[PDB]
Amino acid sequence: TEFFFHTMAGREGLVDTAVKTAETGYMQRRLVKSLEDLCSQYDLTVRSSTGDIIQFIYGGDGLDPAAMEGKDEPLEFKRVLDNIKAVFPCPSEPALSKNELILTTESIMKKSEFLCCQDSFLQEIKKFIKGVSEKIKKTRDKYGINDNGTTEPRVLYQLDRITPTQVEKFLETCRDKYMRAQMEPGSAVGALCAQSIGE
Amino acid sequence: DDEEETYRLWKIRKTIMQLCHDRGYLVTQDELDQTLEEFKAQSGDKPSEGRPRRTDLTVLVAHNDDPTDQMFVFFPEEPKVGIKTIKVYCQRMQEENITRALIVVQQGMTPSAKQSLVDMAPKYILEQFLQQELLINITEHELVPEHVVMTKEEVTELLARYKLRENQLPRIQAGDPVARYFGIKRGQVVKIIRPSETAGRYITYRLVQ
Amino acid sequence: SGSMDKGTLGSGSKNNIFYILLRDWGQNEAADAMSRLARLAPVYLSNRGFSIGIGDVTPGQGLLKAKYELLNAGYKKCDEYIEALNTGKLQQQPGCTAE
Amino acid sequence: KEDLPKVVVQGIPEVSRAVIHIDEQSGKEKYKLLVEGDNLRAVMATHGVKGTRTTSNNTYEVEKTLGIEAARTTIINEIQYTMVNHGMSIDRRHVMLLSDLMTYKGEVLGITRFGLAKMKESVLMLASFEKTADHLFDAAYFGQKDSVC
Amino acid sequence: TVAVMSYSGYDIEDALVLNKASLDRGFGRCLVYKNAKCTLKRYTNQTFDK
Amino acid sequence: RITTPYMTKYERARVLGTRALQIAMCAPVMVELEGETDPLLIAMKELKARKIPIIIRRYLPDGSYEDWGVDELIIT
Amino acid sequence: QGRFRGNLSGKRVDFSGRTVISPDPNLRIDEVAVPVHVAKILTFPEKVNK
Amino acid sequence: MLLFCPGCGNGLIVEEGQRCHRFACNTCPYVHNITRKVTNRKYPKLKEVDDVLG
Ligand SMILES: [Zn+2]
């Protein structure tokens, strides 16, 4: 009896797969035949074959889903900052205070190369920098670390250690990742959407 | 009755105030912010209230554009509005020299009356609104994004920025509930501010056609 | 620290070490790492030995006792529910019938 | 005697059945209505219902009631929710592009042959997809010159 | 004589490793017989395929 | 000058294809190949040396265009 | 099987082969092993240059 | 309810005579005048569920 019930369940699964294959095949054909015309133009506007505009900017932001590192966010700032700290640990430079970190971030962001970057990404970078500066301030307040750089136990400077070289590397890496995460013009956006929905 | 009906009338009046304020017509903040108690003070019962005349509005003038330009709001008492009522309203608008009017029907408009309202006159603009639609403000709904009608200069700037033509913009039907809410004509452009998942906003544009 | 598994070495999602290599140092480093893994792991696995036997799936005495007790308790509770529904009133869960 | 019990005395005639769903949030247990009906405007207009925050599954009803942008948002949310229910994730940009394509002409157009005919213009693609003979004969009758864009 | 183990990573997905000596000693040796048929028919005219 | 300064993957693919097709058809080589009998490898070497004599003509949808040198663009 | 779906959108091609696959971990992820018999059949037209 | 003619067995309808409401048969002169109250209750099913859930 148990064997018969198990076989019933197995045959249910098999017939489910059998019907699903054909149904999704037809849906895939319809979706691709409808969506294949669209293309991401060089003015960042998705246009149909006839020239009509479907979107003024793809995805509202213009970022590639294939290079989408986070959970529908271009970067995971914590991971990037940790990787920058580990790759370039500068042992000959002092750590930065909250005010120093904010000042150097504001100085770097106002350069020309960051102007072409989208304002939302700059706001997110500012928010993350403010959060990490608050973390640094909380740690130094907890352990009584002085921003003068003369606290006797130097190991206390290893708690939340950030240096201007690391800040510059992190900002340049984030800007480069954002620039390289944009839709390359001419990409077959519609076919990608059709396949990524049908599969 | 006499409690839900007066509540519906008050909320219809408040939605009309919000719609007129959004269209640019002159309404005082007291009209925009009217509690139910003040409406009861104006009229506290269904037989006391007169739908055809006690609620009609003619103080609606587009103060931003021209105070001389006038807008009118009608509340026909019959659930279905016939040809004769439309004729009476049109001749009254002729008497007071008013070209823009809204008609808040109670249940519906007869197809002959609808067709007549379509071809009353290009000069006499009248818009049919069901009370059921006006019981809730469309703009206040969370799904509906922010719509702003753009001027001709802004439309020209938008077309010049993308090297575009008018017909290439995404379309929006004239009979759309938002379009009828703002009373936009064919050829006008509406900027839509979609709220993004992040703190940013996505700006798009639609052409009425 | 830690041990490699599907969550970090599999094709599931991000946090994959190969994905990190691809996103940080380009495609060539990721491909070379994949080739090195595919050449190294089989050698160690074959030299170590990894087998599955019938005794790898046989049950212990504690499992047998626990299964017997659980089956008895569950069957008793099911019989109690059957008797409650058949003869008398069974507490009806919201949104559904007694059956 | 056949239909006197079958006359409606109260409620929306299109609405079949509404249930009191409860959210059991630790902060507070809040009550919502799940309506298995097909009249969004009537439900929104009813007293005591916060019509500002009422959604629906039928994209056509949402479109006809609250505009094409509300229809687009409903399409996006419904597709994403359906995909999430099976545990598989799709980047929101794909579904957003699909919704924008479905609602770029001011009307929610399906991916069927009718909506595809209303969207696309090239004769050859319409013929290749479905109804080859009818599309080809209509194009010949209209003398429609088709580009190769 | 099957031994269940992972070997050389050449049996990743449902693949299996065979022993060269076993195949050399006749394990799995198989024969395939195919048919080739022809017809020599006499036609309506008194002439025939030859 | 308004488009992306990065050279897209489609641009790389087409530039490499055209350069390899030209090289296979007895076009002059600018990087002094070292025993490379494959035209595509020679084209990739030219791209790495930034010596490809090809100018991309990026077309805007309205009809406007702009020219970018391969050496002028940024490669990854 | 019409012209549009069977002969226009998707059509058969030459210079192609179809074979059963087997694993091989000693190859890089960007490489595929081709049998000698197939490679002798699938030809590439190389233009003579300097 | 459903009533049938004792004469031929066809269905009886309700009509009005010159004095009273009567059951009558459509195919024969049989009639039956109504003397007292006649009723046919049905007791339709009531909505019993309170519909609290979650
Ligand atoms: Zn009878």
PDB file of N, CA and C in Angstrom, chain B residues 74-151:
ATOM      1  N   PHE B  74     -21.477  70.985 -10.868  1.00  0.00           N
ATOM      2  CA  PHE B  74     -22.888  70.631 -10.857  1.00  0.00           C
ATOM      3  C   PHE B  74     -23.100  69.319 -10.117  1.00  0.00           C
ATOM      4  N   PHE B  75     -24.237  69.222  -9.428  1.00  0.00           N
ATOM      5  CA  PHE B  75     -24.647  68.002  -8.735  1.00  0.00           C
ATOM      6  C   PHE B  75     -26.095  67.692  -9.104  1.00  0.00           C
ATOM      7  N   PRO B  76     -26.317  67.055 -10.253  1.00  0.00           N
ATOM      8  CA  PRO B  76     -27.684  66.659 -10.623  1.00  0.00           C
ATOM      9  C   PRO B  76     -28.297  65.730  -9.587  1.00  0.00           C
ATOM     10  N   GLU B  77     -29.562  65.984  -9.262  1.00  0.00           N
ATOM     11  CA  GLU B  77     -30.236  65.203  -8.233  1.00  0.00           C
ATOM     12  C   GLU B  77     -30.708  63.850  -8.755  1.00  0.00           C
ATOM     13  N   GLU B  78     -31.092  63.771 -10.027  1.00  0.00           N
ATOM     14  CA  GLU B  78     -31.548  62.506 -10.580  1.00  0.00           C
ATOM     15  C   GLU B  78     -30.377  61.533 -10.724  1.00  0.00           C
ATOM     16  N   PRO B  79     -30.575  60.254 -10.402  1.00  0.00           N
ATOM     17  CA  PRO B  79     -29.472  59.285 -10.556  1.00  0.00           C
ATOM     18  C   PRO B  79     -28.957  59.178 -11.979  1.00  0.00           C
ATOM     19  N   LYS B  80     -29.845  59.257 -12.969  1.00  0.00           N
ATOM     20  CA  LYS B  80     -29.471  59.242 -14.379  1.00  0.00           C
ATOM     21  C   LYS B  80     -29.847  60.583 -14.987  1.00  0.00           C
ATOM     22  N   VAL B  81     -28.874  61.254 -15.591  1.00  0.00           N
ATOM     23  CA  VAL B  81     -29.065  62.597 -16.122  1.00  0.00           C
ATOM     24  C   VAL B  81     -29.530  62.494 -17.569  1.00  0.00           C
ATOM     25  N   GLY B  82     -30.642  63.159 -17.884  1.00  0.00           N
ATOM     26  CA  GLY B  82     -31.195  63.149 -19.216  1.00  0.00           C
ATOM     27  C   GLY B  82     -30.713  64.313 -20.068  1.00  0.00           C
ATOM     28  N   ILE B  83     -31.265  64.383 -21.280  1.00  0.00           N
ATOM     29  CA  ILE B  83     -30.908  65.452 -22.210  1.00  0.00           C
ATOM     30  C   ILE B  83     -31.354  66.806 -21.674  1.00  0.00           C
ATOM     31  N   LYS B  84     -32.554  66.871 -21.091  1.00  0.00           N
ATOM     32  CA  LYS B  84     -33.104  68.152 -20.649  1.00  0.00           C
ATOM     33  C   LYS B  84     -32.256  68.780 -19.550  1.00  0.00           C
ATOM     34  N   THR B  85     -31.765  67.969 -18.613  1.00  0.00           N
ATOM     35  CA  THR B  85     -30.906  68.501 -17.554  1.00  0.00           C
ATOM     36  C   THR B  85     -29.609  69.063 -18.131  1.00  0.00           C
ATOM     37  N   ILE B  86     -29.024  68.367 -19.109  1.00  0.00           N
ATOM     38  CA  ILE B  86     -27.820  68.863 -19.769  1.00  0.00           C
ATOM     39  C   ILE B  86     -28.110  70.180 -20.481  1.00  0.00           C
ATOM     40  N   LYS B  87     -29.271  70.274 -21.134  1.00  0.00           N
ATOM     41  CA  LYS B  87     -29.648  71.518 -21.799  1.00  0.00           C
ATOM     42  C   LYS B  87     -29.792  72.658 -20.801  1.00  0.00           C
ATOM     43  N   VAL B  88     -30.417  72.388 -19.649  1.00  0.00           N
ATOM     44  CA  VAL B  88     -30.573  73.411 -18.621  1.00  0.00           C
ATOM     45  C   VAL B  88     -29.211  73.878 -18.119  1.00  0.00           C
ATOM     46  N   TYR B  89     -28.305  72.931 -17.859  1.00  0.00           N
ATOM     47  CA  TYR B  89     -26.980  73.304 -17.375  1.00  0.00           C
ATOM     48  C   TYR B  89     -26.212  74.108 -18.423  1.00  0.00           C
ATOM     49  N   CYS B  90     -26.302  73.699 -19.693  1.00  0.00           N
ATOM     50  CA  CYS B  90     -25.604  74.414 -20.756  1.00  0.00           C
ATOM     51  C   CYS B  90     -26.144  75.825 -20.926  1.00  0.00           C
ATOM     52  N   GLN B  91     -27.471  75.985 -20.890  1.00  0.00           N
ATOM     53  CA  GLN B  91     -28.035  77.323 -21.035  1.00  0.00           C
ATOM     54  C   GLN B  91     -27.730  78.191 -19.821  1.00  0.00           C
ATOM     55  N   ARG B  92     -27.650  77.598 -18.627  1.00  0.00           N
ATOM     56  CA  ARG B  92     -27.226  78.370 -17.460  1.00  0.00           C
ATOM     57  C   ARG B  92     -25.782  78.836 -17.610  1.00  0.00           C
ATOM     58  N   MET B  93     -24.904  77.947 -18.079  1.00  0.00           N
ATOM     59  CA  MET B  93     -23.512  78.331 -18.312  1.00  0.00           C
ATOM     60  C   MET B  93     -23.420  79.430 -19.363  1.00  0.00           C
ATOM     61  N   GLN B  94     -24.285  79.377 -20.375  1.00  0.00           N
ATOM     62  CA  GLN B  94     -24.365  80.471 -21.337  1.00  0.00           C
ATOM     63  C   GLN B  94     -24.803  81.768 -20.667  1.00  0.00           C
ATOM     64  N   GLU B  95     -25.773  81.679 -19.747  1.00  0.00           N
ATOM     65  CA  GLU B  95     -26.251  82.868 -19.046  1.00  0.00           C
ATOM     66  C   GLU B  95     -25.131  83.524 -18.250  1.00  0.00           C
ATOM     67  N   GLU B  96     -24.389  82.733 -17.481  1.00  0.00           N
ATOM     68  CA  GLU B  96     -23.298  83.269 -16.672  1.00  0.00           C
ATOM     69  C   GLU B  96     -21.977  83.344 -17.426  1.00  0.00           C
ATOM     70  N   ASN B  97     -21.952  82.934 -18.696  1.00  0.00           N
ATOM     71  CA  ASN B  97     -20.749  82.979 -19.530  1.00  0.00           C
ATOM     72  C   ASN B  97     -19.610  82.185 -18.887  1.00  0.00           C
ATOM     73  N   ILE B  98     -19.890  80.908 -18.637  1.00  0.00           N
ATOM     74  CA  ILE B  98     -18.921  79.974 -18.075  1.00  0.00           C
ATOM     75  C   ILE B  98     -18.719  78.849 -19.077  1.00  0.00           C
ATOM     76  N   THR B  99     -17.459  78.545 -19.378  1.00  0.00           N
ATOM     77  CA  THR B  99     -17.129  77.561 -20.400  1.00  0.00           C
ATOM     78  C   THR B  99     -16.741  76.199 -19.840  1.00  0.00           C
ATOM     79  N   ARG B 100     -16.269  76.133 -18.602  1.00  0.00           N
ATOM     80  CA  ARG B 100     -15.779  74.897 -17.999  1.00  0.00           C
ATOM     81  C   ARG B 100     -16.713  74.474 -16.872  1.00  0.00           C
ATOM     82  N   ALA B 101     -17.212  73.243 -16.953  1.00  0.00           N
ATOM     83  CA  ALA B 101     -18.162  72.721 -15.984  1.00  0.00           C
ATOM     84  C   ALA B 101     -17.912  71.235 -15.761  1.00  0.00           C
ATOM     85  N   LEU B 102     -18.147  70.804 -14.527  1.00  0.00           N
ATOM     86  CA  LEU B 102     -18.112  69.399 -14.148  1.00  0.00           C
ATOM     87  C   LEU B 102     -19.515  68.993 -13.726  1.00  0.00           C
ATOM     88  N   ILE B 103     -19.895  67.758 -14.026  1.00  0.00           N
ATOM     89  CA  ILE B 103     -21.219  67.243 -13.712  1.00  0.00           C
ATOM     90  C   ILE B 103     -21.021  65.985 -12.880  1.00  0.00           C
ATOM     91  N   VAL B 104     -21.348  66.050 -11.589  1.00  0.00           N
ATOM     92  CA  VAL B 104     -21.169  64.921 -10.679  1.00  0.00           C
ATOM     93  C   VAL B 104     -22.490  64.152 -10.672  1.00  0.00           C
ATOM     94  N   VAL B 105     -22.574  63.148 -11.546  1.00  0.00           N
ATOM     95  CA  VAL B 105     -23.768  62.309 -11.599  1.00  0.00           C
ATOM     96  C   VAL B 105     -23.829  61.414 -10.361  1.00  0.00           C
ATOM     97  N   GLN B 106     -25.026  60.900 -10.092  1.00  0.00           N
ATOM     98  CA  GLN B 106     -25.244  60.073  -8.914  1.00  0.00           C
ATOM     99  C   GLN B 106     -25.124  58.581  -9.231  1.00  0.00           C
ATOM    100  N   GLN B 107     -25.748  58.134 -10.320  1.00  0.00           N
ATOM    101  CA  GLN B 107     -25.650  56.746 -10.749  1.00  0.00           C
ATOM    102  C   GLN B 107     -25.058  56.586 -12.137  1.00  0.00           C
ATOM    103  N   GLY B 108     -25.390  57.469 -13.070  1.00  0.00           N
ATOM    104  CA  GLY B 108     -24.829  57.367 -14.405  1.00  0.00           C
ATOM    105  C   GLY B 108     -25.399  58.440 -15.309  1.00  0.00           C
ATOM    106  N   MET B 109     -24.973  58.388 -16.561  1.00  0.00           N
ATOM    107  CA  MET B 109     -25.419  59.305 -17.600  1.00  0.00           C
ATOM    108  C   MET B 109     -25.924  58.490 -18.780  1.00  0.00           C
ATOM    109  N   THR B 110     -27.114  58.826 -19.274  1.00  0.00           N
ATOM    110  CA  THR B 110     -27.701  58.067 -20.365  1.00  0.00           C
ATOM    111  C   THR B 110     -26.862  58.221 -21.637  1.00  0.00           C
ATOM    112  N   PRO B 111     -26.789  57.173 -22.466  1.00  0.00           N
ATOM    113  CA  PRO B 111     -25.889  57.226 -23.636  1.00  0.00           C
ATOM    114  C   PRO B 111     -26.168  58.388 -24.571  1.00  0.00           C
ATOM    115  N   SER B 112     -27.438  58.743 -24.774  1.00  0.00           N
ATOM    116  CA  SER B 112     -27.749  59.930 -25.561  1.00  0.00           C
ATOM    117  C   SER B 112     -27.207  61.182 -24.881  1.00  0.00           C
ATOM    118  N   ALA B 113     -27.352  61.267 -23.557  1.00  0.00           N
ATOM    119  CA  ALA B 113     -26.799  62.403 -22.828  1.00  0.00           C
ATOM    120  C   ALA B 113     -25.278  62.411 -22.888  1.00  0.00           C
ATOM    121  N   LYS B 114     -24.652  61.230 -22.835  1.00  0.00           N
ATOM    122  CA  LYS B 114     -23.199  61.160 -22.970  1.00  0.00           C
ATOM    123  C   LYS B 114     -22.754  61.685 -24.332  1.00  0.00           C
ATOM    124  N   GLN B 115     -23.429  61.241 -25.395  1.00  0.00           N
ATOM    125  CA  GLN B 115     -23.062  61.675 -26.740  1.00  0.00           C
ATOM    126  C   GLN B 115     -23.289  63.169 -26.915  1.00  0.00           C
ATOM    127  N   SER B 116     -24.376  63.692 -26.340  1.00  0.00           N
ATOM    128  CA  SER B 116     -24.625  65.131 -26.385  1.00  0.00           C
ATOM    129  C   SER B 116     -23.538  65.899 -25.637  1.00  0.00           C
ATOM    130  N   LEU B 117     -23.149  65.397 -24.458  1.00  0.00           N
ATOM    131  CA  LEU B 117     -22.074  66.023 -23.696  1.00  0.00           C
ATOM    132  C   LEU B 117     -20.772  66.023 -24.489  1.00  0.00           C
ATOM    133  N   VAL B 118     -20.566  64.994 -25.316  1.00  0.00           N
ATOM    134  CA  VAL B 118     -19.392  64.967 -26.182  1.00  0.00           C
ATOM    135  C   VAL B 118     -19.441  66.122 -27.180  1.00  0.00           C
ATOM    136  N   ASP B 119     -20.608  66.371 -27.777  1.00  0.00           N
ATOM    137  CA  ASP B 119     -20.740  67.351 -28.846  1.00  0.00           C
ATOM    138  C   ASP B 119     -21.656  68.505 -28.447  1.00  0.00           C
ATOM    139  N   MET B 120     -21.496  69.001 -27.223  1.00  0.00           N
ATOM    140  CA  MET B 120     -22.166  70.242 -26.850  1.00  0.00           C
ATOM    141  C   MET B 120     -21.515  71.387 -27.601  1.00  0.00           C
ATOM    142  N   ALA B 121     -20.221  71.606 -27.341  1.00  0.00           N
ATOM    143  CA  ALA B 121     -19.435  72.622 -28.031  1.00  0.00           C
ATOM    144  C   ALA B 121     -17.957  72.490 -27.674  1.00  0.00           C
ATOM    145  N   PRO B 122     -17.046  72.800 -28.601  1.00  0.00           N
ATOM    146  CA  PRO B 122     -15.642  72.977 -28.194  1.00  0.00           C
ATOM    147  C   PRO B 122     -15.464  74.097 -27.195  1.00  0.00           C
ATOM    148  N   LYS B 123     -16.302  75.137 -27.268  1.00  0.00           N
ATOM    149  CA  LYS B 123     -16.223  76.238 -26.315  1.00  0.00           C
ATOM    150  C   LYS B 123     -16.779  75.844 -24.952  1.00  0.00           C
ATOM    151  N   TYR B 124     -17.841  75.037 -24.926  1.00  0.00           N
ATOM    152  CA  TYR B 124     -18.473  74.604 -23.681  1.00  0.00           C
ATOM    153  C   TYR B 124     -17.897  73.241 -23.305  1.00  0.00           C
ATOM    154  N   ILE B 125     -16.953  73.240 -22.380  1.00  0.00           N
ATOM    155  CA  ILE B 125     -16.303  72.022 -21.908  1.00  0.00           C
ATOM    156  C   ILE B 125     -17.032  71.553 -20.664  1.00  0.00           C
ATOM    157  N   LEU B 126     -17.549  70.327 -20.699  1.00  0.00           N
ATOM    158  CA  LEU B 126     -18.224  69.734 -19.552  1.00  0.00           C
ATOM    159  C   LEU B 126     -17.706  68.322 -19.348  1.00  0.00           C
ATOM    160  N   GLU B 127     -17.393  67.979 -18.103  1.00  0.00           N
ATOM    161  CA  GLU B 127     -16.788  66.692 -17.772  1.00  0.00           C
ATOM    162  C   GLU B 127     -17.718  65.892 -16.873  1.00  0.00           C
ATOM    163  N   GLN B 128     -17.985  64.644 -17.256  1.00  0.00           N
ATOM    164  CA  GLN B 128     -18.833  63.746 -16.484  1.00  0.00           C
ATOM    165  C   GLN B 128     -18.013  63.033 -15.417  1.00  0.00           C
ATOM    166  N   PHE B 129     -18.501  63.058 -14.172  1.00  0.00           N
ATOM    167  CA  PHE B 129     -17.848  62.389 -13.055  1.00  0.00           C
ATOM    168  C   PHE B 129     -18.879  61.618 -12.253  1.00  0.00           C
ATOM    169  N   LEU B 130     -18.624  60.328 -12.041  1.00  0.00           N
ATOM    170  CA  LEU B 130     -19.457  59.546 -11.141  1.00  0.00           C
ATOM    171  C   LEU B 130     -19.091  59.844  -9.694  1.00  0.00           C
ATOM    172  N   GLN B 131     -20.106  59.903  -8.833  1.00  0.00           N
ATOM    173  CA  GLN B 131     -19.863  60.153  -7.414  1.00  0.00           C
ATOM    174  C   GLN B 131     -19.015  59.049  -6.792  1.00  0.00           C
ATOM    175  N   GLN B 132     -19.142  57.820  -7.295  1.00  0.00           N
ATOM    176  CA  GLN B 132     -18.364  56.706  -6.777  1.00  0.00           C
ATOM    177  C   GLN B 132     -16.870  56.927  -6.990  1.00  0.00           C
ATOM    178  N   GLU B 133     -16.483  57.452  -8.158  1.00  0.00           N
ATOM    179  CA  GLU B 133     -15.084  57.770  -8.403  1.00  0.00           C
ATOM    180  C   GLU B 133     -14.595  58.881  -7.483  1.00  0.00           C
ATOM    181  N   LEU B 134     -15.428  59.893  -7.247  1.00  0.00           N
ATOM    182  CA  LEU B 134     -15.032  61.031  -6.426  1.00  0.00           C
ATOM    183  C   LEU B 134     -15.085  60.745  -4.928  1.00  0.00           C
ATOM    184  N   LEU B 135     -15.643  59.607  -4.512  1.00  0.00           N
ATOM    185  CA  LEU B 135     -15.618  59.272  -3.094  1.00  0.00           C
ATOM    186  C   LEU B 135     -14.205  59.047  -2.565  1.00  0.00           C
ATOM    187  N   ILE B 136     -13.230  58.793  -3.439  1.00  0.00           N
ATOM    188  CA  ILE B 136     -11.835  58.616  -3.043  1.00  0.00           C
ATOM    189  C   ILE B 136     -10.964  59.447  -3.972  1.00  0.00           C
ATOM    190  N   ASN B 137      -9.988  60.156  -3.402  1.00  0.00           N
ATOM    191  CA  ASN B 137      -9.075  60.967  -4.196  1.00  0.00           C
ATOM    192  C   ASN B 137      -8.048  60.058  -4.868  1.00  0.00           C
ATOM    193  N   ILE B 138      -7.997  60.100  -6.202  1.00  0.00           N
ATOM    194  CA  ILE B 138      -7.094  59.227  -6.945  1.00  0.00           C
ATOM    195  C   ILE B 138      -5.642  59.566  -6.636  1.00  0.00           C
ATOM    196  N   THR B 139      -5.317  60.862  -6.561  1.00  0.00           N
ATOM    197  CA  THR B 139      -3.936  61.272  -6.329  1.00  0.00           C
ATOM    198  C   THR B 139      -3.419  60.789  -4.980  1.00  0.00           C
ATOM    199  N   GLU B 140      -4.301  60.670  -3.985  1.00  0.00           N
ATOM    200  CA  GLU B 140      -3.889  60.234  -2.657  1.00  0.00           C
ATOM    201  C   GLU B 140      -3.612  58.738  -2.572  1.00  0.00           C
ATOM    202  N   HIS B 141      -3.993  57.962  -3.581  1.00  0.00           N
ATOM    203  CA  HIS B 141      -3.739  56.526  -3.561  1.00  0.00           C
ATOM    204  C   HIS B 141      -2.241  56.256  -3.640  1.00  0.00           C
ATOM    205  N   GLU B 142      -1.793  55.231  -2.909  1.00  0.00           N
ATOM    206  CA  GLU B 142      -0.369  54.925  -2.869  1.00  0.00           C
ATOM    207  C   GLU B 142       0.142  54.403  -4.207  1.00  0.00           C
ATOM    208  N   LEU B 143      -0.699  53.698  -4.964  1.00  0.00           N
ATOM    209  CA  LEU B 143      -0.252  53.155  -6.246  1.00  0.00           C
ATOM    210  C   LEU B 143      -0.042  54.262  -7.277  1.00  0.00           C
ATOM    211  N   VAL B 144      -0.886  55.287  -7.257  1.00  0.00           N
ATOM    212  CA  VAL B 144      -0.811  56.371  -8.239  1.00  0.00           C
ATOM    213  C   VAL B 144       0.377  57.267  -7.915  1.00  0.00           C
ATOM    214  N   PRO B 145       1.324  57.429  -8.825  1.00  0.00           N
ATOM    215  CA  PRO B 145       2.462  58.322  -8.588  1.00  0.00           C
ATOM    216  C   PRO B 145       2.035  59.784  -8.714  1.00  0.00           C
ATOM    217  N   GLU B 146       3.013  60.676  -8.585  1.00  0.00           N
ATOM    218  CA  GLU B 146       2.761  62.106  -8.660  1.00  0.00           C
ATOM    219  C   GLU B 146       2.764  62.555 -10.118  1.00  0.00           C
ATOM    220  N   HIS B 147       1.675  63.185 -10.541  1.00  0.00           N
ATOM    221  CA  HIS B 147       1.515  63.688 -11.899  1.00  0.00           C
ATOM    222  C   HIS B 147       1.530  65.211 -11.879  1.00  0.00           C
ATOM    223  N   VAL B 148       2.312  65.807 -12.777  1.00  0.00           N
ATOM    224  CA  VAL B 148       2.383  67.256 -12.917  1.00  0.00           C
ATOM    225  C   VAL B 148       2.284  67.600 -14.398  1.00  0.00           C
ATOM    226  N   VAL B 149       1.291  68.401 -14.770  1.00  0.00           N
ATOM    227  CA  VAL B 149       1.165  68.836 -16.156  1.00  0.00           C
ATOM    228  C   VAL B 149       2.260  69.851 -16.457  1.00  0.00           C
ATOM    229  N   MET B 150       3.004  69.628 -17.535  1.00  0.00           N
ATOM    230  CA  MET B 150       4.111  70.505 -17.893  1.00  0.00           C
ATOM    231  C   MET B 150       3.662  71.556 -18.894  1.00  0.00           C
ATOM    232  N   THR B 151       4.232  72.756 -18.771  1.00  0.00           N
ATOM    233  CA  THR B 151       3.900  73.852 -19.666  1.00  0.00           C
ATOM    234  C   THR B 151       4.553  73.639 -21.029  1.00  0.00           C
TER     235      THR B 151
END
